[PDB]
C-alpha cells in the first residue's frame, strides 16, 4: 500500500469512553463540529498521510509534524452520517489510556468517504503484516 495524502481542515478532538462504534463517533463528531462552529476561527489546515504504519498528521503551512499516530493505536474510523463532509478516527493516546476522537472537515462527502476507505485499507494491510510477524510498511 502506497501512502496516500489528503489535505483537510482539522475540526478538533473530544474524548470518547469506548474505542469502537458508530454511536460513539456520531456523538463525538457532533460535539467537535459544534465547538468548531462556535470558535469564530478559521480551521487549521492539516495534511494526513495514511499507510499501514498509521496516520501522519502535519501542519500544512509549516510541514511540521503534529503527530505520527501508530496504526496500533487507532481503533475506528468513520465518514460521519449526519455531518457527511467529516472524516474522523478514534485512537488511544500514546501517553496514557484515554481515547480521543479526532475530526477533519473535507470539501465534499466523496472526499470523507475516500479518506475512510483509505484508512480501512491501512487497517487491513497492517493486520496482514501483523499476522506474519512483519513490521507494517
Amino acid at each position: 500500500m502506497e501512502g496516500m495524502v489528503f489535505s483537510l481542515k482539522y475540526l478538533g478532538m473530544t474524548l470518547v469512553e469506548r474505542p469502537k462504534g458508530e454511536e460513539l463517533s456520531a456523538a463525538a463528531v457532533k460535539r467537535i463540529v459544534a465547538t468548531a462552529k462556535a470558535s469564530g476561527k478559521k480551521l487549521q489546515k492539516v495534511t494526513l498521510k495514511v499507510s499501514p504504519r498509521g496516520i501522519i498528521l502535519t501542519d500544512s503551512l509549516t510541514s511540521q509534524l503534529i503527530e505520527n499516530v501508530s496504526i496500533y493505536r487507532i481503533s475506528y474510523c468513520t465518514a460521519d452520517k449526519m455531518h457527511d463532509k467529516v472524516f474522523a478516527y478514534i485512537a488511544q493516546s500514546q501517553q496514557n489510556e484515554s481515547l480521543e476522537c479526532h475530526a477533519f472537515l473535507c470539501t465534499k462527502r466523496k472526499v470523507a468517504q475516500a479518506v475512510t476507505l483509505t484508512v480501512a485499507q491501512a487497517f487491513k494491510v497492517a493486520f496482514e503484516f501483523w499476522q506474519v510477524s512483519l513490521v507494517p510498511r
Binding site: P19, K20, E22, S25, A26, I71, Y72, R73, I74, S75, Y76, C77, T78, A79, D80, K81, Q92, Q113, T116, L117, V119, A120, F123, K124, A126, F127, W130, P136
Partner: peptide
Amino acid sequence: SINFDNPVYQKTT
C-alpha cells in the same frame, strides 16, 4: 456513514 473497526487495534503483544 461508512465506518471501520481496526483489527490490529491494541494488538501489540
